[PDB]
Design a protein around this ligand. Structure first.
Ligand SMILES: [Mn+2]
Ligand SMILES: [Mn+2]
Lengths: 929, 295, 295, 295
DNA sequence: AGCAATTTAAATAGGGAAGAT
DNA sequence: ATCTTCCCTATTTAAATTGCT
């Protein structure tokens, strides 16, 4: 590897970086180094070139592509190294940036006018309840609305009038309404409980007129008259001139505001709100010290009076203005040019040369990567990102362990921690034992990286470790919940960090089908927000349903419409890149996405069907599923075994179902040597982690290394009874599976856990589908709702899987890829597709995906909750002693193959099952006994 | 400027994109909106194409034309399907040598001499193929390329008109497009409006060979209004007649390799400078067009 | 600033100075020095010129060329053009050389039309002398100047060869030089190497004449390699042959007046372009070349 | 220093001549006797060498050793036929991996095991030839080279004493050196005190292979003081086996090519860097001693 | 002998203004 | 407008000296 490093630096920051860059490369003179070094040498040079201080101006070239660029060095757009560098370049009708500047400046000088009431003064001094009857943002909104109703609010002297209690402060003037919504929602968004309003309201002001004081601001309301008697000590020199210059800025630019569309207004006001909380939290974090008394805004850690309200308003204004400037004029730090990506894929990765069919100069890109598992999907996503140049992306993945797997792939192929940042925000205690030096695994949290210039506008220089890893990451391999808060939050400033993260970075969401329906709705909201700033969305899901692919394209198309009309460019359409392991297709799609997507789906189906059938599923006829499991285990051991040894996966639905199947199979008298494992999610930290590592090392069938992790000498049935934790994110390879039916994507995923690593075709049948789910004996009205898309609004007419599924069927992604809306009441696949198009629709609703008008409100974050689960309290095992109503028990010790013990950790119990003892056990975790 | 590098001996070529070209301190330099001013070696530049979002002052054209740099623009009729008017300013302030115009027009007016000259320039396609070989693509000596070159020569030998010629072009180019595509394992349809790299790199190389061909023409004084190939789809003049000598030998292998080996636009552009100066293609075309006019 | 030049009959050679040409609200405009924007009507102009201090952009270039408004880059004054493309019959629909160009070629080829056109260019040079009457210069109707004119007319009409026409042309040109020397009380002998006011002023006026003749030859698509009087090896000899028409009628009296009053070179440039704008000297050369080539 | 570049992936490579080696402002550098200070990349240097008139300091040697750069001194040869004594500072402050030294000791103390290792290391030069094939010089797979390495392998297979290994060593060195001499058409005699370029390029490559061999041995903690091949003529240590595994495969054809093309010594230094870096000869030697140690 | 702190000063870059075309 | 020349303007590099280990 031959690199060349050039320095642009002034100071002796052309000198103390010269020591480190002259420790690793030869000096060719004139502050230019050039030579041969290894990739780990590149990583060491990066780590000790960035850590040496601020102001390092370093460009590295590997062959002729830029390896890395330290700082905001413009370096190369076409040629490299400019010369007569300057300021003043373009100076356009920027319009919408002047609009955002005027809105943020006018609102930020009015965002805390409502702290001047006597209640907030005695709240800061501390002789009343610290919770206000009406929040000060609403009081400042009442001030601004009363001033606007009285005088002309855009060109007049200010003077705060006598204000009363107003239920609504939103009128008709679109720009005033924007300023009012920025003022009122500078801490939290208003929440609308009204069902008719949630049913009908769509527009900007027409929804904003329904935002009343009862949506969170009106806490208790007994001291309203003191909350609206206000002093007017803000009339000073610099506050009045700042208010005048920003109001006239808005006055001069609001003529382009009425030429915007609804989508524009929503996205622009979201940006304005994010910059306003950025400036407000930035000025509230630091201590300024000086004060002019008689009025105060915030308190220090000692509770003393600080940050008087005139200079508080001025500081929040300038900090929000500077926030806006750096978030709207940033050339963000991108990743290194990974040299182990750009070469050809060989063999089964040979489809990854589809990036040589995509244009490298497209400003936008919507990848739908429909490639099957085991083909290197995430490596292909990184290849697609690097085809357009240097990489800046957020790999948002479900589960901690899947982020760990993608991080380990990124580490061992070409990516160091100067470009990658693995973020899992829980600090799990799963450590690697055996040998620390001989590990060559366990990707960790260090991020030598490079701190971006956006950290100076965040509160108190961003944060410590976690938010520095969030914001400053070129490549952010993260759990997805660090990105879905970009679309907005209920309370606080947790929106700004993923918002500013997704503003300048691409978004790569892998296996989006494993998320929930509301989770997929907020993920497509994130896709729309990412496309709002021209970034590229890579979706990587093999079993995509047309509905999902369509609504994600429509979210990207609305976002790219926002980005196109935001830079005053005519919208040519979205560069959609359909991708699988058999080919690629790049089309400029502005309309008719459905026929092209279904034609690519049909081409992928015909490229999947002439291949040999790997998963032949038979739906059993035996009604009782206990003895159906027994007979199917006996049949698939007598048919599918490797010299007497067979691996079976009993995929069931819930935990007590799993322990019921386990306790039946343990007490089942047979000549077969059944060896039973329980693989559900309710387990203690230690025990769970141990199951994972063992299962990953015994079900690895790409080699014969497993022969030494199990007793393959004696003919044995190694059976793993598992819940849907096996069908998501597990690289497992079973000889056969017996599936309790809950949804068709569960069938396809548990087919993907059988012969995942081998290529031998089954002869007779490798999957035995149960006749009924076990909830049929508990609830015959609805049985597929647990881990399925059946529900109270979408009920199957019959629950028989002979009626709702094929008796003999080759299970692949084809049934999920096709998409059928008719006959959803008597087939599982059409039931699935129905729900997917009836929840992820092209409407705005309130919990929908095109959400417009409601982004202003708190409604999409309350009624569409990301990871909406049950109450979930956590019973914690502390050194062998349980906390709550747990009561350790003893398992049946009949056929347990492996049982790992646990002493620490915690189990997640729903509040429903907290009533009784969860009865934790070493073999199977939680049950009802 | 002393003697001034012979225009066959100029090695730098550029197609600038999204910049303001101006003169600073007597420097031909393009400035981007990020504040970066990159200079251009104007006394060594063959051509400067200007892509979308580009702009150039008067003085930059004044000291590019005094140094013999041809400046064209990639829009207007630059959609490359009609190929009608790629807006291409030449330096005619320098009074060019005349004799290549004289021998060129003596053969132009005479239609039989024009037909024979067209056949020589059609044979220059296969001459280019043999002279400029590539070690990362199609071998010229394999059975398919040798068969199609033999078919092309035996068809252009017995050719009678320019309509018969237009057809032989269809065959050579389209089937060489295809033969590469099947060896590069890609279903490929030539489309100037297509987004795949196999077409955007091909259009970039089309502009590069346009610049090389137009610089070779202007060098000798030859214009563009005297083409040898007349047809319905051959609008564009003599610059495309000179340029399609080196599509399938140079521009097409470099574009196909670039797309297959995932090069970026910048490195394909550079691979084009490396092939155009390592084998000295400008002097090749200039000397070969001297062979074409001659008497 | 904004400058209008009538060239053939109705199309106007616009000259733009100290302005930035771009596209505003969907049509080509330019911001001037005074900060006021000026649009351009597409219908009344075909040639648009970019003088000193002028920048144009890419989409403005493309939309100008798509409206038939073909652009050239010139030194400030409008008659010192260094960069353009070649006139076709239509800019978008086809690519054919202009009828004027083809007619010129045919006339040049057959020896009889070349001799007749050489006689005619000298006939119109004598016409130019009378047509463009100056105030400070000698009287064209004076007996000595009319005797020189009739001597040249007899010599051109009775000649049957080109070297006779060269001797007669040199006799007429230097006889007018001798007449203007007899006016301005000096021993004037025409040499390019002299540093006196008359010779160097005539030299840079001749360079201005070469520039305006180059613009007139370009504007009808006439190439710079078909001289009438001068030899086939003379680089750009047609520019010199066309500029000969106004060298002894316009450039010579202006240059001798300029050396007599002794003012500087830039105000001689403004006097030359003022005489070009006032009497439509370029339009005279355009109609001269049309009448020569049409025959 | 995080993860100091594994010794096998260290890339830089020098022998410093007529310069005092020092540290300025953080980095190790060398200052010649004209004021020129050239920096040494100590984090990526494999070895440095010190010729006549060189002088290294204490903290420079410390920054080389703690980073892990083996440093020797080129002069010291005083006999008539042998490269006598090269003085070499081992970085022992870095505590080395141990069991590879234990494996080397368990093969060194057993006489039949040392002979068995002597056998495989003698055919290691034979497979070095087969793997590392240059583009110039001889071809390895010709009839003469294959016949002599076949006779060498047949003789070293039936060998039973170290003196037979020394004799067969001598016939191997005479055979290769003379065949290269034949190819490059020169008369060759290996004298370390000769002014002929084929000889002092070979001594420069002796120093280069010496440095490569101590870096390979020190990377696995192997001392030079355990020579598995020993004799009266062959008394240099283990460096005179792991250094001349790669004479006739790497250095000697490179030395003959450098003495045939005949520029200065610096192209030979850079060519040794290029071939030791491109084919990863250091990592190749380390991996070969790896498959030696555990077998 | 290398370096560090710290001064001292020479020079590099840029912005504004005015004069040319 | 574009570009050049020149005057601030101070920001930015290189040398110089010298205790300190
Ligand atoms: Mn507040
Ligand atoms: Mn505040």
């Amino acid at each position: 590897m031959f690199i060349r490093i050039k320095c642009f630096s002034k100071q002796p920051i052309a000198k103390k970086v010269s020591r480190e860059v002259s420790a690793y490369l030869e000096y060719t003179g004139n502050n230019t180094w050039e030579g041969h070094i290894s990739g780990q040498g590149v990583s060491n040079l990066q780590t000790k070139l960035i850590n040496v201080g601020k102001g390092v101006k370093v460009v590295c070239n590997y062959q002729d592509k830029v390896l890395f660029a330290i700082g905001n060095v413009a370096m190369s757009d076409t040629g490299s190294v400019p010369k007569y560098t300057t300021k003043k370049v373009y100076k356009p009708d920027d319009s919408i940036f002047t609009l955002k500047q005027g809105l943020v400046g006018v609102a930020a000088l009015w965002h805390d006018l409502g702290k001047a009431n006597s209640y907030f003064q005695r709240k800061l001094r501390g002789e009343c309840n610290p919770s206000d009857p009406v929040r000060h943002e609403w009081v400042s909104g009442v001030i601004v609305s009363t001033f606007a109703k009285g005088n002309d609010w855009l060109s007049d002297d200010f003077i705060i009038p006598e204000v009363k209690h107003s239920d609504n402060v939103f009128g008709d003037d679109q720009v005033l309404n924007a300023v009012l919504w920025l003022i009122n929602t500078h801490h939290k968004k208003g929440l609308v409980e009204d069902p008719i309003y949630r049913a009908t309201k769509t527009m900007f002001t027409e929804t904003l007129q329904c935002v009343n004081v009862n949506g969170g601001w009106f806490n208790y309301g007994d001291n309203i008259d003191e909350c609206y008697k206000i002093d007017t000590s803000f009339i000073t020199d610099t506050y009045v001139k700042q208010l005048n210059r920003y109001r006239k800025k808005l006055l001069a630019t609001k003529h382009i505001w009425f030429t915007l569309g609804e989508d524009q207004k929503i996205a622009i006001l979201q940006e304005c709100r994010v910059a306003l909380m950025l400036g407000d939290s930035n000025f509230s974090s630091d201590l300024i010290g000086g004060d002019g008394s008689h009025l105060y805004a915030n308190l220090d850690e000692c509770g003393n009076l600080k940050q008087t309200l005139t200079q508080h308003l001025l500081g929040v204004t300038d900090c929000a203005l500077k926030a806006l400037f750096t978030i709207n004029h940033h050339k963000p730090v991108k990743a290194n040019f990974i040299p182990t990506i750009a070469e050809k894929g060989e063999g089964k990765f040979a489809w990854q040369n589809g990036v040589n069919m995509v244009d490298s100069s497209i400003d936008n890109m919507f990848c739908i990567n429909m490639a099957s598992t085991g083909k290197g999907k995430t490596l292909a996503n990184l290849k697609l990102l690097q085809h357009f140049g240097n990489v800046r992306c957020s790999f948002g993945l479900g589960m901690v362990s899947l982020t760990k797997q993608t991080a380990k792939q990124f580490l061992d192929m070409g990516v160091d921690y100067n470009s990658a940042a693995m973020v899992t925000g829980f600090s799990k205690s799963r450590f690697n034992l055996g040998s620390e030096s001989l590990d060559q695994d366990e990707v960790s949290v260090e991020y030598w990286g490079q701190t971006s210039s956006l950290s100076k506008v965040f509160p108190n220089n961003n944060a410590g470790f976690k938010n520095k890893k969030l914001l400053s990451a070129p490549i952010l391999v993260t759990t997805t919940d660090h990105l879905v808060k970009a679309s907005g939050v209920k309370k606080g400033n947790k929106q700004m960090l993923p918002y500013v993260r997704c503003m300048h970075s691409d978004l790569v969401l892998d296996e989006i089908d494993d998320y929930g329906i509301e989770d997929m709705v907020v993920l497509a909201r994130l896709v729309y927000l990412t496309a709002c700033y021209g970034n590229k969305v890579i979706i990587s899901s093999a079993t995509i349903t047309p509905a999902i692919s369509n609504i994600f394209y429509e979210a990207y198309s609305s976002g790219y419409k926002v980005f196109c009309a935001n830079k005053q460019t005519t919208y040519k359409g979205v560069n959609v890149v359909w991708w699988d392991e058999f080919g690629i297709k790049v089309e400029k799609v502005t309309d008719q996405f459905s026929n092209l997507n279904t034609r690519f789906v049909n081409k992928r189906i015909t490229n999947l069907l002439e291949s040999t059938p790997k998963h032949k599923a038979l739906v059993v006829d035996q009604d009782d599923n206990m003895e159906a499991v027994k007979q199917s285990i006996t049949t698939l051991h007598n048919a599918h075994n490797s010299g007497g040894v067979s691996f079976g996966l009993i995929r069931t639905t819930t935990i007590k179902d799993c322990v019921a199947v386990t306790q039946e199979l343990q007490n089942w008298e047979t000549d077969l040597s059944i060896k039973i494992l329980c693989y559900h999610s309710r387990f203690v930290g230690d025990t769970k982690a141990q199951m994972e590592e063992y299962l990953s090392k015994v079900l690895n069938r790409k080699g014969d290394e497993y022969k030494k992790f199990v007793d393959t000498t004696t003919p044995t049935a190694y059976i793993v009874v598992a819940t849907p934790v096996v069908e998501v994110g597990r690289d497992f390879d079973f000889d056969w599976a017996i599936i309790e039916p809950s949804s068709e994507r569960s069938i396809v995923q548990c087919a993907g856990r059988v012969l995942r690593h081998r290529s031998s075709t089954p002869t007779t049948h490798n999957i035995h589908i149960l006749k009924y789910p076990f909830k049929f004996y508990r609830n015959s009205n609805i049985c597929y709702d647990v881990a399925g898309y059946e529900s109270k609004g979408y009920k199957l007419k019959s629950k028989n899987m002979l009626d709702i599924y094929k008796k003999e069927s080759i299970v692949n992604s084809v049934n999920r890829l096709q998409g059928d809306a008719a006959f959803y009441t008597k087939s599982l696949t059409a039931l699935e597709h129905k729900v997917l198009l009836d929840k992820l629709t092209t409407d705005i609703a309130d919990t929908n995906v095109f959400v417009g008008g409601w982004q202003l409100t708190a409604n999409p974050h309350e009624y569409c909750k990301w990871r909406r689960g049950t109450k979930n309290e956590d019973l914690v095992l502390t050194d062998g002693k349980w906390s709550g109503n747990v009561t350790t028990t003893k398992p049946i010790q009949s056929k347990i193959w492996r049982k790992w013990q646990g002493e620490n950790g915690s189990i997640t119990v729903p509040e429903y099952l907290l009533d009784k003892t969860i009865c934790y056990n070493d073999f199977y975790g939680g049950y009802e006994n | 400027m002393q003697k001034q590098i012979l225009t066959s001996q100029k090695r730098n070529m550029y197609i600038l994109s999204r910049c303001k070209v101006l003169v600073k301190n007597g420097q031909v330099c393009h400035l981007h909106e990020d504040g970066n001013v990159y200079t251009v070696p104007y006394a060594n530049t063959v051509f400067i194409g200007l892509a979308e979002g580009t702009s150039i002052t008067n003085e930059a054209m004044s000291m590019l034309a005094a140094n013999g740099v041809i400046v064209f623009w990639t829009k207007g009729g630059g959609y490359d399907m009609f190929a009608a008017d790629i807006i291409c300013h030449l330096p005619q302030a320098d009074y060019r040598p005349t004799k290549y115009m004289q021998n060129w027009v003596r053969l132009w007016l005479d239609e039989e001499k024009k037909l024979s000259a067209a056949k020589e320039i059609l044979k220059m396609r296969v001459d280019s193929l043999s002279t400029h070989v590539h070690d990362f693509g199609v071998d010229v000596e394999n059975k398919r390329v040798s068969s199609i070159v033999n078919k092309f020569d035996k068809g252009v030998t017995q050719a009678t008109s320019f309509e018969s010629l237009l057809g032989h072009e269809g065959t050579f180019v389209k089937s060489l497009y295809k033969e590469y595509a099947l060896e590069y394992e890609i279903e490929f349809k030539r489309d100037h409006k297509s987004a795949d790299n196999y077409n955007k790199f091909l259009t970039l190389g089309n502009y590069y060979a346009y610049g090389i061909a137009r610089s070779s023409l202007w060098a000798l004084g030859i214009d563009n209004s005297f083409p040898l190939l007349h047809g319905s789809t051959r609008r564009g003049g003599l610059v495309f007649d000179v340029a399609d000598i080196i599509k399938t030998s140079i521009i097409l292998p470099l574009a196909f390799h670039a797309a297959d080996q995932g090069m970026s636009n910048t490195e394909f552009k550079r691979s084009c400078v490396a092939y155009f100066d390592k084998n000295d293609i400008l002097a090749y075309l200039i000397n070969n067009i001297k062979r074409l006019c001659m008497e």
